Amino acid sequence: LAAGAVILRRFAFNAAEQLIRDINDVASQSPFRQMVTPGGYTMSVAMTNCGHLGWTTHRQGYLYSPIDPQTNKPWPAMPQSFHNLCQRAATAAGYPDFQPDACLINRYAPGAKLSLHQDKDEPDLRAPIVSVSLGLPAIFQFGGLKRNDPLKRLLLEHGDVVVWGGESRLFYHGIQPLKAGFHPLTIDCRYNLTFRQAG
Ligand SMILES: O=C(O)CCC(=O)C(=O)O
Ligand SMILES: [Mn+2]
């Protein structure tokens, strides 16, 4: 279905409760904000980061910054639960040398979406991206190298971890409007953690 992608469904189930406590802690220092894309449009997905570097939008485009543009303070440190879960996930996928220095935390409110894009702000594209889904289920869609390539759908549920390596690392991807509902741990939203080798 996807070359280089290792899907580990429900892998983060045991760590989930502590990951949500740590997202809330990260958010108390660097709050969730809906970033404004270079063209002047506010994204529906609320984001924040933890680690040495953090993904953000800017006037000139998209970049990794060691400073939070909103608080003007550094991003919070990468929590131990985050580091430990990512490490075990990457190792189980055949990447024991993967050491992330950036974790983009996405919050999806009901109806929130993320249109087709590529993750190409990283120095080494051979390095994977570890994605961890928490809360409400979402339909992830992926294509190919071009923007007009056929889209394939994949449901990502609570605890699902996918290590996007190989060819799948360069694929155009996104999230369809989050369907309304309830989850015992997140109430009415979905969280997604994307660990990156940004330095
Ligand atoms: O929410 C997801 O599962 C994907 C998020 C994503 O692709 C991104 O933020 O770069
Ligand atoms: Mn992405």
Any binding-site annotation on 57? no
Q: Please check whether residue 133 is in contact with residue 157, taking contact to mean a CB–CB distance below 8 angstroms.
A: yes
In this structure, CATH architecture of domain 1-199 = Sandwich (2.60)
The residue among 64, 27, 77, 38 whose CA lies nearest residue 191 is 27
Domain boundaries, the chain: 1-199
Calculate how far, in angstroms, residue 7's C-alpha sits from the geometric centre of ligand 2: 16
Which-ligand-closest: CA of 191? Answer: 1
187: left (phi over 0), alpha (psi -120 to 50) or beta: left
Other C-beta atoms closer than 10 Å to the C-beta of 12 total 23
Calculate how far, in angstroms, residue 129's C-alpha sits from the geometric centre of ligand 1: 10
Place of tokens 């108390």: 28
Q: Enter the tokens of residue 16.
A: 């989930």
Name the method of structure determination: X-ray
Nearest CA to ligand 1 atom 3: 192
Q: State the resolution, in angstroms.
A: 2.1
